[PDB]
Amino acid sequence: MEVIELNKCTSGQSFEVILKPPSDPSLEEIQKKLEAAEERRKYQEAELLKHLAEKREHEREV
Amino acid sequence: MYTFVVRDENSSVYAEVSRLLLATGQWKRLRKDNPRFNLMLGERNRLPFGRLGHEPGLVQLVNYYRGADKLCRKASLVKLIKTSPELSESCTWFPESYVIYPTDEREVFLAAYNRRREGREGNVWIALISSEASELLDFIDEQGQVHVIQKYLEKPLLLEPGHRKFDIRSWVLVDHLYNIYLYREGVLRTSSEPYNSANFQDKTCHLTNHCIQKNYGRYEEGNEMFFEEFNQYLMDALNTTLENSILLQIKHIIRSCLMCIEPAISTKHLHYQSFQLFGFDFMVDEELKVWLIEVNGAPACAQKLYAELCQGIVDVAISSVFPLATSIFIKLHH
Amino acid sequence: MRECISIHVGQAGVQIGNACWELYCLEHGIQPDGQMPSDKTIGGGDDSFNTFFSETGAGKHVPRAVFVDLEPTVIDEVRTGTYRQLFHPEQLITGKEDAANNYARGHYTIGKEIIDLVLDRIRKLADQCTGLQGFLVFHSFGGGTGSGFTSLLMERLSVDYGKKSKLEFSIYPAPQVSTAVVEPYNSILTTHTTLEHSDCAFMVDNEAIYDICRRNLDIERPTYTNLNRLISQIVSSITASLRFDGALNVDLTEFQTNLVPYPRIHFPLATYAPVISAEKAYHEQLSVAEITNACFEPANQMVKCDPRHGKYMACCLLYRGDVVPKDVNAAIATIKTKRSIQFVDWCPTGFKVGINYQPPTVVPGGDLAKVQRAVCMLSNTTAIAEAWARLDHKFDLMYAKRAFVHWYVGEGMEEGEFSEAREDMAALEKDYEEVGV
Amino acid sequence: MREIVHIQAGQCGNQIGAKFWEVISDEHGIDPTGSYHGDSDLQLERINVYYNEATGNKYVPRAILVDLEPGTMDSVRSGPFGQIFRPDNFVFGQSGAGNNWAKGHYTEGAELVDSVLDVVRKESESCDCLQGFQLTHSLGGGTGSGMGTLLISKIREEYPDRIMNTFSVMPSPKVSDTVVEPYNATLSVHQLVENTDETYCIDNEALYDICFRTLKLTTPTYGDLNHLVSATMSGVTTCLRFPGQLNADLRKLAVNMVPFPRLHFFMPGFAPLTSRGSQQYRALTVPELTQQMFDSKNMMAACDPRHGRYLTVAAIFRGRMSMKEVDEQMLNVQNKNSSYFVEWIPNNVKTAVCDIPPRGLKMSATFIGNSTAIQELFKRISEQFTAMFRRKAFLHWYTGEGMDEMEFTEAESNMNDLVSEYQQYQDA
Ligand SMILES: Nc1nc2c(ncn2[C@@H]2O[C@H](COP(=O)(O)OP(=O)(O)OP(=O)(O)O)[C@@H](O)[C@H]2O)c(=O)[nH]1
Ligand SMILES: Nc1ncnc2c1ncn2[C@@H]1O[C@H](COP(=O)(O)OP(=O)(O)CP(=O)(O)O)[C@@H](O)[C@H]1O
Ligand SMILES: Nc1nc2c(ncn2[C@@H]2O[C@H](COP(=O)(O)OP(=O)(O)O)[C@@H](O)[C@H]2O)c(=O)[nH]1
Ligand SMILES: COc1ccc(CCc2cc(OC)c(OC)c(OC)c2)cc1O
Ligand SMILES: [Ca+2]
Numbered sequence A: 001m002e003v004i005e006l007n008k009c010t011s012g013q014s015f016e017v018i019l020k021p022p023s024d025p026s027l028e029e030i031q032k033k034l035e036a037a038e039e040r041r042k043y044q045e046a047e048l049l050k051h052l053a054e055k056r057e058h059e060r061e062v
Numbered sequence B: 001m002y003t004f005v006v007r008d009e010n011s012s013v014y015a016e017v018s019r020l021l022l023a024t025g026q027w028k029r030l031r032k033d034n035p036r037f038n039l040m041l042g043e044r045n046r047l048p049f050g051r052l053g054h055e056p057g058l059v060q061l062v063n064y065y066r067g068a069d070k071l072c073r074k075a076s077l078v079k080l081i082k083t084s085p086e087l088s089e090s091c092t093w094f095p096e097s098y099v100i101y102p103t104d105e106r107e108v109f110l111a112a113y114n115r116r117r118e119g120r121e122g123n124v125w126i127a128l129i130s131s132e133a134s135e136l137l138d139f140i141d142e143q144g145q146v147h148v149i150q151k152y153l154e155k156p157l158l159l160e161p162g163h164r165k166f167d168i169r170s171w172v173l174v175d176h177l178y179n180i181y182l183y184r185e186g187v188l189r190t191s192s193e194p195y196n197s198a199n200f201q202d203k204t205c206h207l208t209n210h211c212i213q214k215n216y217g218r219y220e221e222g223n224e225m226f227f228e229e230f231n232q233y234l235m236d237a238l239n240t241t242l243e244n245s246i247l248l249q250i251k252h253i254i255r256s257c258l259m260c261i262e263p264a265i266s267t268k269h270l271h272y273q274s275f276q277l278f279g280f281d282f283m284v285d286e287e288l289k290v291w292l293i294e295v296n297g298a299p300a301c302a303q304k305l306y307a308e309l310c311q312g313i314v315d316v317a318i319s320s321v322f323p324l325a326t327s328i329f330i331k332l333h334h
Numbered sequence C: 001m002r003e004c005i006s007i008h009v010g011q012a013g014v015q016i017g018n019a020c021w022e023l024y025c026l027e028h029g030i031q032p033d034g035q036m037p038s039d040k041t042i043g044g045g046d047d048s049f050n051t052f053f054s055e056t057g058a059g060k061h062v063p064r065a066v067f068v069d070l071e072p073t074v075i076d077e078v079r080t081g082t083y084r085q086l087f088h089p090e091q092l093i094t095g096k097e098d099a100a101n102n103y104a105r106g107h108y109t110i111g112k113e114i115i116d117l118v119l120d121r122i123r124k125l126a127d128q129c130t131g132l133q134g135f136l137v138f139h140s141f142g143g144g145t146g147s148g149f150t151s152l153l154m155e156r157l158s159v160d161y162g163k164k165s166k167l168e169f170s171i172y173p174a175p176q177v178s179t180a181v182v183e184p185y186n187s188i189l190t191t192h193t194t195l196e197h198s199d200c201a202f203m204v205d206n207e208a209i210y211d212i213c214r215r216n217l218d219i220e221r222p223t224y225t226n227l228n229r230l231i232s233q234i235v236s237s238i239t240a241s242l243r244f245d246g247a248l249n250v251d252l253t254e255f256q257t258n259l260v261p262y263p264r265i266h267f268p269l270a271t272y273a274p275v276i277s278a279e280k281a282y283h284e285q286l287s288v289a290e291i292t293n294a295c296f297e298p299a300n301q302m303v304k305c306d307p308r309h310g311k312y313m314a315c316c317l318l319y320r321g322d323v324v325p326k327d328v329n330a331a332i333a334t335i336k337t338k339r340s341i342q343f344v345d346w347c348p349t350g351f352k353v354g355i356n357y358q359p360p361t362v363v364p365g366g367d368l369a370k371v372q373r374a375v376c377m378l379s380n381t382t383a384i385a386e387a388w389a390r391l392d393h394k395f396d397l398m399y400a401k402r403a404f405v406h407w408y409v410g411e412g413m414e415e416g417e418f419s420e421a422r423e424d425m426a427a428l429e430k431d432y433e434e435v436g437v
Numbered sequence D: 001m002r003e004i005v006h007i008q009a010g011q012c013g014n015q016i017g018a019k020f021w022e023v024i025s026d027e028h029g030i031d032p033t034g035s036y037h038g039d040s041d042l043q044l045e046r047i048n049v050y051y052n053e054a055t056g057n058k059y060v061p062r063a064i065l066v067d068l069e070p071g072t073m074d075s076v077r078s079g080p081f082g083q084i085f086r087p088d089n090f091v092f093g094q095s096g097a098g099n100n101w102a103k104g105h106y107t108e109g110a111e112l113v114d115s116v117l118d119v120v121r122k123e124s125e126s127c128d129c130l131q132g133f134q135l136t137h138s139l140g141g142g143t144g145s146g147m148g149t150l151l152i153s154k155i156r157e158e159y160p161d162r163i164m165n166t167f168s169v170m171p172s173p174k175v176s177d178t179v180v181e182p183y184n185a186t187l188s189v190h191q192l193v194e195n196t197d198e199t200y201c202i203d204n205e206a207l208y209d210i211c212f213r214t215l216k217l218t219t220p221t222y223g224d225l226n227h228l229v230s231a232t233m234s235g236v237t238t239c240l241r242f243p244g245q246l247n248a249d250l251r252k253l254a255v256n257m258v259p260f261p262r263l264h265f266f267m268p269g270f271a272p273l274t275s276r277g278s279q280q281y282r283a284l285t286v287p288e289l290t291q292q293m294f295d296s297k298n299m300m301a302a303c304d305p306r307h308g309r310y311l312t313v314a315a316i317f318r319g320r321m322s323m324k325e326v327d328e329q330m331l332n333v334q335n336k337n338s339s340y341f342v343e344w345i346p347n348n349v350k351t352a353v354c355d356i357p358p359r360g361l362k363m364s365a366t367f368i369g370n371s372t373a374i375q376e377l378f379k380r381i382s383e384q385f386t387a388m389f390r391r392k393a394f395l396h397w398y399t400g401e402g403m404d405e406m407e408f409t410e411a412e413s414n415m416n417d418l419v420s421e422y423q424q425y426q427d428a
């Protein structure tokens, strides 16, 4: 019902119509989490290379 | 094939509906959590309406209308009738009602209860039944559940022989097109003990539920009188018909209620579709006026009518959207 | 004048960026080589379009944009496309092997290796800014880059530019044009990590856009090009207030002020009308009342949901074309009496309206018809939570068996992040339920 | 990730491998000399995935040919497309493995594996971004089976972050070289379960039944069997070789196909099924393709799909057809048989279309299914394995090469575990 704060210009116009009234982590913490994940990757790949190392030992033994 | 799921096990109505669908040989049932269904017979409460209509290659239909609870909850049914201009406060077919919370419309209710005392006229109300307001207010705060205070119909129509009270139950099926189909078979849920004008604690002759009664079965089987007999009684006893004296008002009330909420619940342009079966409970006073008491969103049928009604639900609501290979319903036009 | 930097991440963001900047160039009269004859102040200025374009001494208008992808296939088509001369080579950043639809791979494994390079190229544009106010970030929820790298970028921008507003345009995953079965995983993970770092986010469900293309543009099987040209129209509507003269939504902070009263509930629903096919030989132009009423049909929303069963917290109407306030208020009065529009009790029932007289521009030979007037409604309704419920249920179904979780752990992510992200989503859904019912 | 390194080992591996290079070379328009005489640029847009570009406009397959027996390798160089292969990439021994897994893996193959790894390293170094490896091999002999898995273990040591894909032909008594094949396959499956990301289980039982029952070939040869393999191999690599909306690669396939690392054994399928020479004149309709590719009669692994559930499915249609109709037909099948797809993986069926049809067909469809019914194959191998192992029969061939009975018991139990892991998700 009530039209307010109407502004006009060559491009167009804007306004507001009211129908009824009412009633961050740091840089350090990021770089630490990104590198905790890389450590978890290194460990998993180290475990793989250790398992593959055991397999090579077995291949020599056979 | 078509596919459907069953997520309300306690539903006797749709236990029969799913059984009939299987018997066609063209409907396969799935597990609760399988999402690739054409039809859902969903759960009574917290039904996941936000997950419907997002299956590519599947037209999805459900047996409930989101938002229909505003008609099927006593507290919200009162709010809807008082606040909707289409219904008004001067609504002539709904008893005076007031929302009361256990801790709101308690100052509004007691101010009109004085007009009933200063005029000294009939001043009985229902929530249990009492003639004094503060008697059951002690019992409203006693439960901690939002109760509705309603003026009780002191002068009801009484069937003879028996001088009994009753309530009329009507079954209304609204389809995806929002056509309103009134099942032609109603039921009178009758009292077996005579109506006492001053035995409010005696609940058997005042509350006409099928559970309270079960003199039960004396006058008719299961305290259920169907329309063939009630129409004949009105002809003989009052020189009128069921259609003229009562049924015109019932169809007006059903049409009015369901038109009021149609913009809020209609699935005309939705990504999923809805239908729903409703049970309307009506009262008849002695001057042959029909009053609306409550609307049931999850109604149970009467034993004799299950077969015919459930076939109709499949006919007009389900196969209307998923075809295959007289009507029992009265279309309430609008 | 205060500049805005656009960041386009992954395939979806890059390709949508192309559609947007193509549209911007047509709208502002900028040619594919960057010349803008209507700009009489050569080599500089503080006009409204300078919020999105810087100027060279030779008169080139260059987008304040950075494109980032972990693989070079998509950005290469920018490097060689019709608008190749528009951008500076340092704004197009590519790796060689993408995130393989893996949020963890984009965030941790590959993201960590390229994040510093991107922030340096972003810093290059910020140094060209006299008043940088914030960024517009375009990305998919589903891709490994769109989800994983964006969240890493968003967390860093908060550190390097804590004082700057960040807006998102997010492509919500849909099975119809989906890329991966794990897209629900990437969506919840990226939403959880980005939530504190975004001030306002406009989700676009690929399902909604797909159906709009089928239903209104008469396109059997829409392509990304079909979808992107339509998305770019909505983005252009949402950003027009930053690029043109006007009183409403003139700075990024105003999007938060006007659309987001609660910080976590910062996902406004966009609804756009009319969408009309170019092939349609006979058309009856739609009035202000008809297009404004169209803003309340779910079939026109960017996300399919039912606003009638939610509550509104803010509502803006952005018109373009032949529209005057008198006709808008007449449409609003009619719509108010006939539709279910409930606001929360602690917010006023009112529409903020902006009108741009220039009607929407359409790409020559595109699928959208020219229209005399169009409108984009931005409403913050709890109903958009339906999309979170849909997404969270799919997440729950797979995660109960821990399906595919091993691909993420394998990249250095802990299984606990899945449940942390999901619990945050559980909190978000509870937030919407309070405000909404 | 663009470049794939191809390795084919032993007789079966090299023959199906050579047939593969014949087929996709024709599709990409490359002649036996290595020159492009095609017409569409789509043939060249992703030709680098499988071909190195050579001096003088010549395309050289990124293929390493390995055998312990010089025989089949001479058959390749003298074969139709044998000239195209890089000569330095032929790596052969002299004695052969004698259908002995232990000789391929531990004694004879170990002597030659380093020379293969040098050729692998030389091809990898020419790679802009190597995405992974594919191996063709049988599991029933000794070279492709025993040495093939030895290479795979070695490649994982040197390229632990690259994808390992195999096309593994399964032994069958209906097409049987020797009685020890269940031993070689059970030992190889033990390796494949740990050291590959994706294994296409090409079952000689299915290839024979297709030739006998469906194609009406009363006494089918390996040539008839390999016609089915090369068509399937062409189909499952379509998305890697051609420009698509998807822009697919081996890693995205593994991510989306494999919900649990060990359950990565795919059941492939093809439609329409055609025998050699006898051409097709009646093109199939989209509904016919969809029905056939999901039919057990078109499965390349002898397993009944209705005895399990699909965890994930990938389907690639080739030819000029309605992509809308493909979408409606795929949605049709999943919706009419939803009980055979797991309900806890939403949207687990993915579909792609490629404009370019294969030679001799105008419409074709390749099926890649990760089904729990694949356990029927492993149970078939396990029963034949146990039938002999309970009497330690034929084991001396292996203990003579240094193997212990314990190594047989372990391989047996791991394959039984794989079997029970599949059953776990069939009922879930
Ligand atoms: N609307 C629209 N959506 C797209 C487009 N491209 C990709 N998507 C969506 O993005 C999701 C997949 O994420 P992508 O952006 O393609 O992948 P990415 O960001 O490059 O990350 P990677 O997985 O490493 O490639 C899918 O759900 C697609 O629907 C596009 O051009 N337009
Ligand atoms: N205002 C009123 N005046 C007269 N009788 C009333 C009344 N309100 C309720 N009643 C009686 O009380 C009985 C039960 O009322 P109500 O309909 O609230 O119970 P209910 O909801 O358990 C029945 P249903 O099984 O349909 O759900 C009705 O049969 C009716 O006869
Ligand atoms: N489909 C198919 N299977 C083969 C072919 N050659 C051998 N096989 C199968 O592979 C097994 C023998 O392995 P083989 O390749 O000869 O041993 P290798 O040369 O030492 O690797 C047997 O079970 C055969 O059925 C072939 O050309 N096609
Ligand atoms: C549900 O399963 C999915 C599976 C595969 C993908 C993407 C990868 C992908 C799809 C292919 O389409 C068939 C394909 O072709 C064989 C391919 O080959 C490299 C790779 C997405 C999924 O969502
Ligand atoms: Ca200027």
Ligand SMILES: [Mg+2]
Binding pocket: C010, C011, C071, C098, C143, C145
């Ligand atoms: Mg990508």
Ligand SMILES: [Mg+2]
Binding pocket: D011, D012, D141, D177
């Ligand atoms: Mg042999």
